[PDB]
Nucleic acid binder design. Structure first.
Length: 181
DNA sequence: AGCACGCTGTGTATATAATAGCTATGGAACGTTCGGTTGTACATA
Protein backbone atom coordinates (compact mmCIF):
# COMPACT_ATOMS: atom_id res chain seq x y z
CA UNK A 1 0.00 0.00 0.00
CA UNK A 2 2.68 2.49 1.03
CA UNK A 3 4.90 1.75 -1.96
CA UNK A 4 7.97 3.00 -0.06
CA UNK A 5 10.46 0.59 1.54
CA UNK A 6 12.48 1.83 4.54
CA UNK A 7 16.24 1.89 4.04
CA UNK A 8 18.58 0.30 6.57
CA UNK A 9 21.15 2.64 8.10
CA UNK A 10 23.01 0.63 10.76
CA UNK A 11 23.50 -3.01 11.74
CA UNK A 12 25.00 -3.95 15.12
CA UNK A 13 26.41 -7.48 14.84
CA UNK A 14 28.32 -9.43 17.48
CA UNK A 15 30.97 -12.08 16.79
CA UNK A 16 33.10 -14.36 18.96
CA UNK A 17 36.53 -15.89 18.38
CA UNK A 18 36.85 -18.34 21.28
CA UNK A 19 40.30 -17.09 22.31
CA UNK A 20 41.83 -14.50 24.63
CA UNK A 21 43.48 -11.49 22.99
CA UNK A 22 46.15 -9.05 24.18
CA UNK A 23 44.60 -5.67 23.44
CA UNK A 24 47.87 -3.74 23.64
CA UNK A 25 49.42 -6.02 21.02
CA UNK A 26 46.44 -5.51 18.72
CA UNK A 27 46.53 -1.73 19.19
CA UNK A 28 50.25 -1.47 18.39
CA UNK A 29 50.27 -3.81 15.36
CA UNK A 30 46.89 -2.88 13.82
CA UNK A 31 46.57 -0.14 11.21
CA UNK A 32 43.78 1.98 12.74
CA UNK A 33 43.42 1.01 16.41
CA UNK A 34 42.54 3.19 19.40
CA UNK A 35 43.01 1.43 22.75
CA UNK A 36 42.39 3.62 25.81
CA UNK A 37 41.68 1.31 28.78
CA UNK A 38 40.94 4.22 31.13
CA UNK A 39 37.62 4.98 29.41
CA UNK A 40 36.56 1.69 27.80
CA UNK A 41 37.75 -1.92 28.02
CA UNK A 42 38.16 -2.60 24.29
CA UNK A 43 40.29 -1.56 21.32
CA UNK A 44 38.31 0.45 18.77
CA UNK A 45 39.29 -0.32 15.18
CA UNK A 46 37.92 0.85 11.83
CA UNK A 47 38.20 -0.26 8.21
CA UNK A 48 37.38 1.72 5.09
CA UNK A 49 36.05 -0.67 2.45
CA UNK A 50 32.76 -1.51 4.24
CA UNK A 51 33.13 1.52 6.56
CA UNK A 52 32.41 -0.27 9.85
CA UNK A 53 33.66 0.03 13.43
CA UNK A 54 34.58 -2.86 15.70
CA UNK A 55 34.88 -3.03 19.49
CA UNK A 56 37.32 -5.90 20.12
CA UNK A 57 37.38 -6.97 23.76
CA UNK A 58 40.05 -8.87 25.68
CA UNK A 59 37.80 -11.96 25.89
CA UNK A 60 37.77 -12.55 22.12
CA UNK A 61 34.34 -10.94 21.67
CA UNK A 62 33.78 -8.50 18.80
CA UNK A 63 31.00 -5.96 18.23
CA UNK A 64 30.84 -4.82 14.60
CA UNK A 65 28.64 -1.84 13.78
CA UNK A 66 27.97 0.62 10.96
CA UNK A 67 27.28 -1.81 8.11
CA UNK A 68 24.41 -0.90 5.79
CA UNK A 69 23.63 -4.50 4.78
CA UNK A 70 23.33 -7.86 6.49
CA UNK A 71 26.04 -9.33 4.25
CA UNK A 72 28.31 -6.28 4.42
CA UNK A 73 28.51 -6.76 8.19
CA UNK A 74 29.69 -10.33 7.58
CA UNK A 75 32.43 -9.11 5.24
CA UNK A 76 33.52 -6.48 7.77
CA UNK A 77 33.53 -8.94 10.67
CA UNK A 78 35.44 -11.50 8.61
CA UNK A 79 38.09 -8.92 7.68
CA UNK A 80 38.45 -7.85 11.32
CA UNK A 81 38.98 -11.49 12.31
CA UNK A 82 41.50 -11.91 9.49
CA UNK A 83 43.41 -8.85 10.69
CA UNK A 84 43.54 -10.39 14.16
CA UNK A 85 44.73 -13.62 12.53
CA UNK A 86 47.52 -11.87 10.61
CA UNK A 87 48.72 -10.49 13.93
CA UNK A 88 49.23 -14.06 15.15
CA UNK A 89 46.45 -14.52 17.70
CA UNK A 90 44.31 -17.65 17.53
CA UNK A 91 41.21 -16.16 15.89
CA UNK A 92 38.49 -18.15 14.11
CA UNK A 93 35.25 -16.82 12.65
CA UNK A 94 32.40 -18.16 14.76
CA UNK A 95 28.76 -17.50 15.74
CA UNK A 96 27.62 -14.31 13.97
CA UNK A 97 24.30 -12.86 15.15
CA UNK A 98 22.80 -9.51 14.17
CA UNK A 99 21.67 -7.94 17.44
CA UNK A 100 20.09 -4.75 16.08
CA UNK A 101 19.05 -3.14 12.79
CA UNK A 102 18.22 0.55 12.31
CA UNK A 103 16.18 1.80 9.37
CA UNK A 104 14.90 5.19 8.30
CA UNK A 105 12.26 6.47 5.90
CA UNK A 106 9.77 9.28 5.29
CA UNK A 107 6.03 9.10 4.64
CA UNK A 108 6.26 12.40 2.71
CA UNK A 109 3.66 14.36 4.69
CA UNK A 110 3.46 16.06 8.12
CA UNK A 111 2.07 14.03 11.02
CA UNK A 112 0.11 15.46 13.95
CA UNK A 113 2.10 14.04 16.85
CA UNK A 114 -0.43 15.22 19.44
CA UNK A 115 -2.88 12.78 17.84
CA UNK A 116 -0.91 9.54 18.08
CA UNK A 117 0.06 10.59 21.61
CA UNK A 118 -3.67 10.77 22.45
CA UNK A 119 -5.30 8.05 20.34
CA UNK A 120 -2.45 5.59 20.99
CA UNK A 121 -1.54 6.29 24.60
CA UNK A 122 -0.53 2.76 25.62
CA UNK A 123 2.35 2.69 23.10
CA UNK A 124 3.25 6.30 22.28
CA UNK A 125 5.12 8.64 24.62
CA UNK A 126 5.20 12.30 23.52
CA UNK A 127 7.21 14.68 25.73
CA UNK A 128 8.22 17.36 23.21
CA UNK A 129 10.36 19.54 25.53
CA UNK A 130 12.84 16.66 25.89
CA UNK A 131 12.94 15.12 22.40
CA UNK A 132 11.13 16.58 19.36
CA UNK A 133 10.02 13.11 18.27
CA UNK A 134 7.23 10.83 19.39
CA UNK A 135 8.31 7.37 20.56
CA UNK A 136 6.06 4.50 19.43
CA UNK A 137 6.81 1.12 21.05
CA UNK A 138 5.18 -1.40 18.73
CA UNK A 139 4.29 -4.68 20.43
CA UNK A 140 4.45 -7.07 17.45
CA UNK A 141 7.10 -7.08 16.13
CA UNK A 142 8.76 -5.55 19.20
CA UNK A 143 10.24 -2.46 17.52
CA UNK A 144 10.57 1.17 18.59
CA UNK A 145 9.62 3.92 16.14
CA UNK A 146 10.61 7.58 16.38
CA UNK A 147 7.90 9.64 14.67
CA UNK A 148 8.65 13.27 13.81
CA UNK A 149 6.49 16.19 12.70
CA UNK A 150 8.33 16.44 9.37
CA UNK A 151 7.00 12.99 8.48
CA UNK A 152 10.25 11.07 9.05
CA UNK A 153 10.19 7.66 10.74
CA UNK A 154 13.14 5.88 12.38
CA UNK A 155 12.88 2.12 12.96
CA UNK A 156 15.19 0.49 15.50
CA UNK A 157 15.15 -2.80 17.42
CA UNK A 158 14.59 -5.30 14.61
CA UNK A 159 16.83 -8.36 14.56
CA UNK A 160 16.06 -9.30 10.94
CA UNK A 161 15.18 -7.29 7.84
CA UNK A 162 11.63 -8.69 7.82
CA UNK A 163 10.50 -7.19 11.13
CA UNK A 164 11.56 -3.66 10.17
CA UNK A 165 9.43 -3.89 7.01
CA UNK A 166 6.54 -5.49 8.92
CA UNK A 167 6.54 -2.69 11.50
CA UNK A 168 6.38 0.06 8.87
CA UNK A 169 3.57 -1.63 6.94
CA UNK A 170 1.64 -1.81 10.23
CA UNK A 171 2.34 1.84 11.16
CA UNK A 172 1.54 3.53 7.83
CA UNK A 173 -2.28 3.46 8.27
CA UNK A 174 -2.28 5.03 11.75
CA UNK A 175 0.24 7.61 10.50
CA UNK A 176 -1.88 8.56 7.49
CA UNK A 177 -4.98 8.91 9.67
CA UNK A 178 -3.26 11.81 11.48
CA UNK A 179 -2.08 13.90 8.52
CA UNK A 180 -2.14 17.62 9.30
CA UNK A 181 -4.30 19.76 7.03
C1' DA B 1 36.73 46.09 19.37
C1' DG B 2 31.75 45.06 20.05
C1' DC B 3 27.53 43.14 17.79
C1' DA B 4 24.89 40.22 14.31
C1' DC B 5 25.17 35.99 11.86
C1' DG B 6 26.88 31.31 10.18
C1' DC B 7 29.14 26.77 11.54
C1' DT B 8 30.20 23.36 14.72
C1' DG B 9 30.05 20.43 18.71
C1' DT B 10 27.16 18.87 22.92
C1' DG B 11 22.87 17.10 25.08
C1' DT B 12 18.45 14.49 24.76
C1' DA B 13 15.56 10.12 22.67
C1' DT B 14 15.66 4.82 20.63
C1' DA B 15 17.47 -0.03 19.99
C1' DT B 16 21.62 -3.42 20.78
C1' DA B 17 25.90 -6.42 22.07
C1' DA B 18 30.27 -6.46 24.69
C1' DT B 19 33.22 -5.31 29.57
C1' DA B 20 35.27 -3.59 33.79
C1' DG B 21 34.91 -0.41 37.27
C1' DC B 22 32.77 1.85 40.83
C1' DT B 23 28.48 2.99 43.43
C1' DA B 24 24.25 2.25 46.43
C1' DT B 25 22.21 -0.66 49.91
C1' DG B 26 21.18 -3.88 53.44
C1' DG B 27 23.48 -6.66 57.23
C1' DA B 28 26.94 -7.21 60.95
C1' DA B 29 30.41 -5.94 64.04
C1' DC B 30 33.57 -2.92 67.16
C1' DG B 31 35.41 1.62 69.18
C1' DT B 32 34.70 6.42 71.04
C1' DT B 33 32.01 9.85 73.73
C1' DC B 34 27.61 11.64 76.23
C1' DG B 35 23.74 11.36 80.45
C1' DG B 36 26.10 4.21 143.07
C1' DT B 37 24.04 4.65 147.34
C1' DT B 38 20.80 2.46 151.17
C1' DG B 39 19.40 -0.62 154.36
C1' DT B 40 19.37 -5.05 156.81
C1' DA B 41 21.90 -9.58 158.11
C1' DC B 42 25.56 -12.02 159.65
C1' DA B 43 29.70 -13.17 162.16
C1' DT B 44 32.86 -11.81 165.64
C1' DA B 45 35.35 -8.39 169.44
Amino acid sequence: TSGIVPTLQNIVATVTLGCRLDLKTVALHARNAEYNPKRFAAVIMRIREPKTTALIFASGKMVVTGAKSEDDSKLASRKYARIIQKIGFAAKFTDFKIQNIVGSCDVKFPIRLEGLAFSHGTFSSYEPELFPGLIYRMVKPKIVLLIFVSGKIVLTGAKQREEIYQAFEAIYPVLSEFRKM
